[model samples]
Target: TTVDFTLHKIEQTSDEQIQNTGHDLGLTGRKPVQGAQFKIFNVTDAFYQLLENHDKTTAASMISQNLGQYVNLQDPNAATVTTDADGLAAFKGLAAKTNGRHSVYAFHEAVTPQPYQKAADMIVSLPVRQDDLTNIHLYPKDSLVTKNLTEINEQAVATKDLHDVAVGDVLTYQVQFQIPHDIGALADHSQDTFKYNQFKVLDYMTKEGLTFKALTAITVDGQDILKALTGKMAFMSSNDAAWQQTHNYPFGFELDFLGGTDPDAVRNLLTQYAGKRVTVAYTGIVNEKMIPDQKVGNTAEVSFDPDSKITVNGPEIQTGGIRFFKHEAGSSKSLANATFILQRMNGNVREYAVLEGVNGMAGTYQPTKITWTTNQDAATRLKTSGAETANLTIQGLLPGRYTLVETAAPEGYEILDPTTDFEVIAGTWGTKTIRIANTPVNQL
Candidate 1:
């Protein structure tokens, strides 16, 4: 007699079913589950006698407890077999029960694939109970895997995925997720204890939005795991690790918590965090590539298994600018030769905004740096351009308070009030604009 087994992944509602029947039992939702491994064992003479005396359920339960004593785990013929794509595994060439004696065998699941849980051990008796002896089919049911992923802000106070920022400003993003239930069995750093050998989290940023900074910290249920993963874990970049790179991501990085080459150091670290809330916080700098009102996005993905991954989007950041127009005191005609200095104020300290352009010309100026200046000569001078003199824009400034000081007067014009305070708010093409008028020298 031979044994035939069929592995079917079923939902929780499909648990109750008839066994050994050739019918599908209306399991329409059930599908063939592959990659599950099973090891078959021959029951000893005494265990065979015990199996014949008890019911199927009691026999299987007793065999599981005394598996080592009653069954030969080291039997060469007791080989391991894996379920095929059709969810079928056949053990052929089995000795048939004859002369009032039955052939008893025990089986245990060695491995279970993703999206399914571990299955329990079972026992089978081969015989003609006036039933189909050759076509003894075994059906096992499995449950599903559950997890949650979310994006939190720097303070860990709330879920905020959008921010208004400047080019030089830095923002923190927290990627929090509940660890998989079977993470311990999912990886073995030195050996293959399960089907999967790797697990990690991948983070990516747009080249236009933010510069990829460092992954500062990681915590599992309030316990810090950064120090443990520093040396053993592999932190790889998108350019170096070709397979882990995401499309359109110029600067992507991954934290491989369960590295294969190493010992059990990294494996044990993640196993303890299984089924716990994990928070991975990283920082990014808003870059000059960000345009006004343009949304720069960041994202994170957790690779739990080879075929399963979950992605969550982090905060989207935006940058704005400030524009200034200089003209005659009473007319709209633009004046060309006026010069000014822009300073960002923080309490009483003044940090001068360094513009990137010619000092004597009016054009689009990008604020590249903020430095402490001892004198006006060292400060960036924003001079009205003779060409397009009416529109002098300082792009990429965070929404905040700043001081615009008139350093020099235009030709045949006098500088009015020396200093004017302005605020940069988020809007289209520098929504905050200031009109400067130079009175004639005789007016002063």
Candidate 2:
């Protein structure tokens, strides 16, 4: 047996609220009153079609201006009154309570600058069922975004020669990158299951040459190279033969060294060695086996070696020369009895020599009377030296550009400028005198 359903058009009516203000009756106070009107309509398409047909001929019944008013039935008695020049209806009263399933249609006059009016219709299934509006699904996942600026700067430094890096010049750089791991794939063991692992640097530049050290220093368990990838440094997916033929590794690292050798020179050298294959070696951690020697095609290589062995042209001078001055006015003092300190603008502080007096006084001016002290703590201090005076000298300082400052002045005299600053060229020195004025009468 088949059940036949017949569609019946249901009609309902209600009112929407509107506000209006007026002056006091006799200056006692202002007041507001509520009222209502009737707008006839049905909740089905049949009734809507009837209204559309009736609005065609009659000027007053036309739907052009009052069309939205009839279509939007949110307020059964919103207003049947025609709109003013500004397209606004006189404020009516609040909607009256109604029974049974009723649909509401409302028309909102478009404010100035707008092209047309707005109409909205809603089916209020009475009594309103609360369950129909409640959401029951779980929340969506949050997405994360990050960037690596260090890697970008490194690349810029490499390709564009942005920082003017030269060969044999060392610079410290920070890198940042990520290692992909699939937890679900590791649970199931099948050919279809993808392998999950961290990013590895097959090889990296070192003093000897490119070494495949597996970057043990910067990782959490000292096994991966992800932690060392700071700033713009990052990981990239490469489907080269070296990666695919070995393991199910998905990504690897491209390390671009910054502020060391000129990248153009390195690239030129790498290009010359292109097509030549070499073996890369690396050490393994406790559980993991070491990566065996792997053959890799040398795509490019460059050397910064100039034609000549020694590039220096000018005559060299001995830096850090210690000059001794005897107090002709007062008693003589040993240069060994004085203290020396080396300070730098880069916040490096070091005490060079706390020399002992070879002679207690100026009894004799012999070489042994001024024995030089050697062993002391040294630090890299970034300080600029004065052009007028010579630069100070400390041992173990490699050839480089650095600013120099005097951290501690000599005894009996303060530094000419306590912050006496200077610059130290690779093979240069700085010097300044500590003046000794006459003693005060009170001390005598």
TM-score of each: 0.55, 0.19
Q: Which stretches of candidate 1 lie over 4 Å from their true place?
A: 1-159, 186-193, 237-247, 327-337, 343-362, 369-379, 387-391, 400-403, 416-421, 432-435, 439-444
lDDT, candidate 1, at 52: 75
For candidate 1, write residues 122-166 as lDDT tens digits: 666666455255545567553333222132223333444556665
Quote model 2's TM-score. 0.19
Tens-place lDDT per residue, model 2, 197-251, is 2122332221111112243234322233223233323322233455445444332
Stretch of 10 with least lDDT, candidate 1:
144-153
Model-by-model lDDT, in order? 0.62, 0.25
Off by over 4 Å in 2: 1-334, 337-392, 395-409, 412-415, 426-444
Model 1 residue-pair collision total: 1
